[PDB]
Design a protein around this ligand. Structure first.
Ligand SMILES: Nc1nc(C(=O)O)c(CCc2ccccc2)s1
Ligand SMILES: [Zn+2]
Ligand SMILES: [Zn+2]
Length: 241
C-alpha cells in the first residue's frame, strides 16, 4: 500500500517512486500521483501531468507538498533527464499548488490563472510567478502563455472553484480536467466547499466543448476515464441548482 482511501489504486503499468506513483498515459505523457495522509481517514490521491515536448518537460500541477514535488522533479531527472521548462498549476488548493516552493527553488517558471495568484495568499500558499488571463469564451490569452508547446489552457468557468483551469494536450487525445471533473462512477463531486454550484454544470460542459475530440479525460482524484466523466460530472452538477 499504495492503497489510498480516495483516488485510483495501483494497477499494472504503475511505477512507484519514493512516495509517489507514475503512470505513462501516452508516449510523451505521464500522470503523477501523490498522497496526503488524513488522520482517521487514510490517504487521498491527487494527480497531475508530465509532458515531454522535444528537449524539455512541462508539468501540470504540483504534489500536495514541497518534498513530494521535489520527488516529481527527481523522477523526471531519472526517467527523462530533460529540463523542466515550466509548470502550470490549475487552482489555489493544496493538491495543486502545495509544492510551489520546490518548483521555484529548482528554477522552474510557474504559471497560474491570475485569479489563482490573487487567491493563493489567502489560502496560505505561494502564487505562481506568472499570471494567465483568459478570453470571454475561456481560451487563454496566448501572450500570457508563451512557449507552452502542446499545453492548451482553457478556463471553463467557475465550478469546483472560481479559478479552476483545464489543460488539453495538443497532439494527443488527452485533456486534463483537474478538480473540476470527477469520474463516471463517482457518487459525489468531491469537495464543494469553494464551489460555484450555480455555474458548475455549464463549466463542466464548457470543458467538454473546448476539447471535443479528447477521448481520455485525466482528473485530480481518479484514474483517467472516458468522456463519460464529463457528462456524469455535468449531470451531478445539474442537481446542485
Ligand atoms: N484536496 C481535495 N480535493 C478534493 C476535490 O474534490 O478536488 C477532495 C475530495 C476528494 C473526492 C473526490 C471525489 C469523490 C470523493 C472525494 S480533497
Ligand atoms: Zn480544489
Ligand atoms: Zn482537489
Amino acid at each position: 500500500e499504495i492503497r489510498p482511501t480516495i483516488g485510483q489504486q495501483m494497477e499494472t503499468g504503475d511505477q512507484r517512486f519514493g512516495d509517489l506513483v507514475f503512470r505513462q498515459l501516452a508516449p510523451n505523457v505521464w500522470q503523477h500521483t501523490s498522497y496526503l495522509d488524513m488522520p482517521g481517514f487514510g490517504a487521498v490521491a491527487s494527480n497531475g501531468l508530465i509532458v515531454r515536448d522535444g528537449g524539455r518537460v512541462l508539468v501540470v500541477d504540483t504534489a500536495w507538498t514541497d518534498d513530494q514535488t521535489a520527488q516529481i522533479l527527481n523522477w523526471i531527472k531519472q526517467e527523462i533527464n530533460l529540463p523542466v521548462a515550466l509548470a502550470v498549476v490549475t487552482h489555489a488548493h493544496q493538491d495543486k499548488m502545495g509544492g510551489m516552493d520546490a518548483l521555484h527553488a529548482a528554477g522552474i517558471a510557474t504559471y497560474a490563472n491570475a485569479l489563482s495568484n490573487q487567491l493563493a495568499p489567502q489560502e496560505g500558499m505561494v502564487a505562481a510567478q506568472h499570471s494567465l488571463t483568459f478570453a470571454a469564451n475561456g481560451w487563454v490569452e496566448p501572450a500570457t502563455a508563451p512557449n507552452f508547446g502542446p499545453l492548451k489552457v482553457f478556463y471553463p468557468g467557475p465550478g469546483h472553484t472560481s479559478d479552476n483551469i483545464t489543460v488539453g494536450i495538443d497532439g494527443t487525445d488527452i485533456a486534463f480536467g483537474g478538480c473540476l471533473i470527477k469520474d463516471s462512477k463517482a457518487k459525489s463531486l468531491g469537495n464543494l466547499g469553494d464551489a460555484d454550484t450555480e455555474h458548475y454544470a455549464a463549466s463542466a460542459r464548457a470543458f467538454g466543448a473546448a476539447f471535443p475530440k479528447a477521448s481520455m479525460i485525466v482528473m485530480s482524484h481518479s484514474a483517467p476515464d472516458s468522456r463519460a466523466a464529463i457528462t456524469h460530472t455535468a449531470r451531478m452538477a445539474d442537481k446542485l441548482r
